[model samples]
Target: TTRTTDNPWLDARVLNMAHAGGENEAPANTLYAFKRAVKLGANMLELDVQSTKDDQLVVIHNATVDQTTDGTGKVRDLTFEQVHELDAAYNFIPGRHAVPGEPPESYPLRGVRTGEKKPPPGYQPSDFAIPKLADVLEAFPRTPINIEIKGTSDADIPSFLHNAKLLARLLKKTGRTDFIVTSFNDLAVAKFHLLAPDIPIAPGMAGLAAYFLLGVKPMHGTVALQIPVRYQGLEIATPEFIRRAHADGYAVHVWFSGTAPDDEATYNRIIDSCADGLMPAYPALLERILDERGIERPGRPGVDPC
Candidate 1:
């Protein structure tokens, strides 16, 4: 049951997946962040897709715009125009902010060396705006996209399916095959598979646990396991886990939430473990680590694209 890749689009070693367009680098899921990730030489862009009131797909993480935008409302309740009007970078403190007990050097990405905040200078609020999925696709036509369908409520299942179907249509219209769709909800994943059978998909949370904890393999339509290094206390991505996943014809993509203190060490460990891909919130840091060790960045070979 070893993994196989016959598709040219799937051919890539060491994938550099930018988690939510490198959320630490810019406002997560915004066009600016996605472009920044590409400029940083990321091969794949990971983003969350949610449907708006008018059936437009916007790339934002939370169910509502309350967290990231200036306006407050559920993404499903607002039209794409309404969603676009809010400032996506409203809450983003660029340099760094204090974490009370966490050391002063903790906010390296944000630039909070001391207790003072250091948001990037000369940044205009007007420069950031919520972007539609079509905008993202147009921005990066050839780059591989990892789309995570977002909706947790039982009532939102229909909306997730609608988003998935629309997404499939969009990809087909653009003739884009280098994409992977995933979701925590198994039903959502299944719905997407039924609608877009040609697209590759990663296993859901339950399927991931089944494959990782037990020897049971995933069902059909699963090609990758995009998972965190650990869940609660369980060690999810061990050497044996990766080996077994490869044996069953699945790729292992590590997801680092960017909240840990020892990410540098963890990055080294995962790389040494031979993970197929890495999703890091701070891709610039990951780029640096790979560069120091003389490792090739994922998807691109020769020359520094950044």
Candidate 2:
């Protein structure tokens, strides 16, 4: 029999995590999107956190504001006030991501930030702005949050380390235990783990490699494994991989990478493989699918396998 450290984070059958606040369903990473996702039955929120020029922690999915906002420049170069000025829903259209160059009429939520358009029911215009990690933590006080520490695309080591420490400070100050933080940069994850030793972690690439490839075993406080279904055409997160992860006492949360089809069939296959959670771009569809299959969410009204 395999022996593994017991994980407290796995308390449900599956965690219906909203990836980027269900990016395709709403403006990604905005408070408005998070609210909509939760209203649609998403139990956990999956987002990316980056530090700004003034050392403020903001939740945005891009290294720059170019893709998802009406602003320009890297997130590291923007301040909290500057980020607040840009519309997080500037380029969004229903059923598609933030695509630039579209006609003005195509974006229904575009002018709401500036009061040129009205917001949906129960949401203020400010809800569509890029949100801070602190606000999200407070807004969704009880739901589980899965955060990814993102750095510059150019492999800027200092940037990665800075964001990691910043996040560690922010989270430690709150003393919340229901959050899971991870990053593809192993050093960043290690740094955060060093400072906030009590919080659970899902290993980054190097840590996963060390465990799966070099026999390094799970990191000190690791309780979950967050991975992509595929990367560069490699079928990495197979059923066998998840089985072994379960045997070792780590819950496996799957995400889709690249251009792989993230449809119902794909989710069904992963569910059948016994994945504990999925961070999907369409949480509503996933929620309905999980419901049809009789899978209860984490906190099991109803459970994530660890």
Candidate 3:
């Protein structure tokens, strides 16, 4: 497959970001993970932004805090003050897990293995807090940010719109150009684009299908197509798909999601199919694979393994 990329941002083979701030290594969506990813030489920080009850923008993946935090409530219903009370690292097991039984059916922070589980020396849940959008921007000035507006359902539209508006304002105020705003919800993407026209945006589900099913190029604003290599059972990253996307002048980014380990073959396949970038949940594994394969990152190689 012939790969092509003119955008300086898509120059690297693996444009790494700690998807939810290294979801497998630290309490996801927290400053801890974001800082760790930067230290690991991750080129970008991928995070989800949501609106709180007071209309403040905060970084969190789910609409509800049940999964990532000790608190249980909708992000939109809780004030930022109330959200600060929840421990984002309550469920995260830093050092090890039990040694014998199979991994838990569903562990969010990371996999569960039977072993002698213990906390990292001086580990404290208080150290991990659900960060506000403002704090992240202020903290990581030079790092690129990939913001996924997380409003996928109909009931989430109102809050999602509020989130989009606030996020636009924040990004604009920062005067940063190394950020891309994306979402699965087309409506949310459109709303965001309206507010922040200068920042780059990616096609949502509606545009994804239109390009694939109807063979129509995106007519609106979109610089990239960030999608999974396969969704459900459908193969999305075919040679033809990549060709069309490149022809339409959009960079193709494959996101490696789920609880599974990073598959080396999958990474190779996407590269062969001419993918412009990748979002791996396990940055450590990706760094190792890239090294073993003797693949040189487009720029100076700074990414380090976990």
Candidate 4:
């Protein structure tokens, strides 16, 4: 009973999505990681959008830069110039994401931003620092971006709303067609949809729960159901769940369950369930598995290297 859906972003199988720019495979949400992931056959870039104190939109994952960068401060508390000046890869240890106390030599990509070390060939020093959402859009005009509006906390409704409005305006100005906005806060998703009605979004926890636990489907411009394989010991990504979602014209994209191992077994299982997409922290590993199994990805955009 699957209906033919006209949503262009949903037309794909086994989409290799880079979670925060393949955080473990490379630095999380850095331009260098995004650039390399696409080169490795990742068709989608997943990221978080937050605003700085000065009202600039940036592409980063944390409410505070303490974990991901050398800086210490909340994104909304810092100015755009301050956030932009921090090294996004300061603590990134290849294959482990970011680890603070490791030996200095463990961070291969460190100091490249401060010019103490040279960037790898084909990349600029600026690629190692935090990037603006505008920068990513400009760099990958044809590629699709999965943007999650972030807040100070999951309960901070006002924070999420503030960022959502900022994102909606930025997207409207950019006039792009290949971006999907989502949020864990349902209100954020609703607000953004109202501002940018033409863009599609995935349901947050509340909307997803309403659809599955009850029969209330999201009325907003929902294009996909981005979920983890399991949630709080419940199997949310069962075959039946996927089948029903597909019948309703919703694409299924699975991420890692919070406590579950993110190894090959997890990847293989989701692939077996026939998910339309997999958001992997290790895009390189995901790409390898797909290649070995002969799974097809979305068609790559033909634009030349940046």
Question: By lDDT, who's the top model here?
Answer: 4
lDDT of 1 at 300: 52
List where candidate 3 sits over 4 angstroms from the true fold.
Answer: 1-6, 10-12, 93-127, 152-155, 259-261, 301-306
Q: Candidate 4, residues 1-306: lDDT per residue as tens digits?
A: 996558654467778889988988888998999999999989889988888999888888889999878899899999989998888889999767889988889999888888888898999888987899999989999888999999988768999999999899989988886788999999999999999998889998999999988968875699989988878778887778887887887888888735456678888888877788889988999888888777655664221111
**Model 1 lDDT tens row, 1-306:** 987555342246577788887777666887767777877878789999888889888898888887775578788899988988776766665433112234434433322211134434533333366778898888788888999988736566777777778787786787776888998877778888887888888888888778777777875777788888878777776787887777766787889773343267888788777777788777788878877777755445643311
| Per-residue lDDT value at 187 in model 2 | 85
Native-referenced Cα lDDT, model 1: 0.73
Which ranking of candidates, highest lDDT first? Answer: 4, 2, 1, 3
- Lowest summed lDDT across 10 adjacent residues in model 3 is found at 110-119
Model 2: pairs clashing at backbone N, Cα or C within 3 Å: 11-303, 12-303, 12-304, 13-303, 299-302
The Cα error of candidate 1 at residue 138, in Å, is: 0.8
The residue-by-residue lDDT of candidate 2 on 1-306, one tens digit each, is: 888456765555587788999888899999998999999998889999888899999999788999888889998898899998888999998877799889898897998887888899899988999899999999998888999999977478778899999999989998798889999888888999999998888898888777665657767789898888886566757888888877777888899744456689888888877888888888899998988767756545532222
TM-score for all models, in order of appearance: 0.83, 0.94, 0.82, 0.93
